[PDB]
Structures are given as C-alpha cells and as structure tokens.
C-alpha cells in the first residue's frame, strides 16, 4: 500500500520492506504454523486469482504517468 | 490371645488394601497423563491439517477462476 502511494523510485524501499517481512515469518514459523510466505505475499499483492500483482500495475502505472514523461536519461552515468 | 490375633489379620488385611488402592491410584495417573499426552497429539495433528486445508485452498484459487 505505500508503494501505491509513492513513485517507481520507492521500489527499492518496498523490496527492503519485504525482505524484512520475510524474516519476520521465518524466525515465527520456528514456533508456529504459518501460511507460506510466497502464499501470504501473492494473496496480498492480489496475485493468486489474477495474473498480474498490484506491484507489477503500480510500476506500469507509474511508468506511464510519472517516469517517461519527467524523467531525463544521462547515457554517460546511466 | 483372640485379640492379639485379630491385630496380626488386620495388618496383613490393611496392606494388602493399601496394595490394591496404590494400584487403582497408578491406574488413575496413566489415565490423566495419557489424556494430555493425546491432547498435545490431537492440537498437532489439528494444526498441520489445518494448515494442509490452507494451503489446497490457495492451491485452488491459483487454478480457477474468480467470482
């Protein structure tokens, strides 16, 4: 959800996030029984009935209203 | 003399009680602790299946169609 709400430059952010979210559940599924990760993940990017997640959407979302029309490519430092 | 004999009877008469009451007491322990040991069984076994429907739920919603 906050990276519905930011640009396609707060993905990496989202990545951190999830990769903390994904240690969360590994050091709790020592003691409990959870839903797997990547079954908890899909059903929350809406990606299990759907072929393409709210991620993927919101990057094209953003490519289209935001990145190519405000965004100025530097071929020297890429 | 009857007295004194019927003192020796009552002491092999009362252990041999005490033999059979400690016993339907060993009786009653395996009772409990074999009903907490079940209990702890029957919480994995309804934990792990639980988690079995889950999963084939998800699996199913993956393989389907939406309403």
Known sequence: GRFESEDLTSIVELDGLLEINRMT???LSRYLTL???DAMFREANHNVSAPYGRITLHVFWELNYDFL???CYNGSTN | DPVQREIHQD???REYIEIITSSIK???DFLNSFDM???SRLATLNEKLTALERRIEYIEARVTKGE
């Open chain 1, 25 to 27: 559940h590994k050091l």
């Open chain 1, 35 to 37: 839903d797997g990760f």
């Open chain 1, 69 to 71: 029309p405000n965004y």
């Open chain 2, 11 to 13: 002491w092999a008469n």
């Open chain 2, 26 to 28: 060993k009786i009653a």
């Open chain 2, 37 to 39: 040991s079940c209990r």
